[PDB]
Amino acid sequence: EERLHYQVGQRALIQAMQISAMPELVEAVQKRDLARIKALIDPMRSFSDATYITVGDASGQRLYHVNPDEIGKSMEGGDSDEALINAKSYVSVRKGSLGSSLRGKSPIQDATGKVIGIVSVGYTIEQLEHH
Ligand code: NA
């Protein structure tokens, strides 16, 4: 019965699962084509009500972030291991550079199931429109 913005986390998780399963994103990540990834994610970032979307490679190095300088740097929050190593999809909460946020995380996988990256869709808590 104890909740931490349950509906927001479910919305984030659903979106991360959907984005991570896109064949075009799987291909762009395999090729490490940054511009292609940006072209695919920007419109989704614009359309979603999420605060941000981050895409990382298999080692957790960012291939996309809303802040340009973060691209090429490692996701050091410590809450990406279960997706990157164990291919789990889940809701996580953490204060990264963009503030305390609820994240939906899901691995990006090739056709054989190998994890090749991660998608994190986040909602910064202080910015939620309360009900
Ligand atoms: Na996934």
22: CA distance to ligand 1 center in Å?
9
Q: Among 110, 88, 127, which residue's Cα sits nearest to residue 28?
A: 110
In sequence order, which residues have a C-beta less than 8 Å from that of residue 44 and are 6 or more positions away? 19, 53
Task: Map tokens 């429109």 to a residue.
Answer: 129
Taking the C-alpha atoms of residue 92 and residue 103, their distance in angstroms, rounded to an integer, is 5
φ, ψ of residue 107 to 5 degrees: the values are -75, 155
Q: Report the run of H or E that residue 17 belongs to, with start and end.
A: helix 6-20
Token readout for 102 is 């609820």
Residue 126 φ then ψ, to 5°? -65, -25
The residues with which 130 forms a beta bridge, in sequence order, are none
CA of 119 from ligand 1 middle (Å) equals 8
Q: What's the CA-to-centroid distance between 94 and ligand 1, angstroms? A: 20
SS3 84: helix
Sheet holding 62-64, edge to edge: 62-64, 52-57, 115-124, 99-109, 90-96
CA gap 26, 29 in Å, rounded = 5
Residue 117 CA to ligand 1 center (angstroms) comes to: 9
Topology of the domain covering 1-131 = Beta-Lactamase (3.30.450)
Question: What was the resolution (in A) of this experimentally determined structure?
Answer: 1.6
Question: What was the structure determination method?
Answer: X-ray
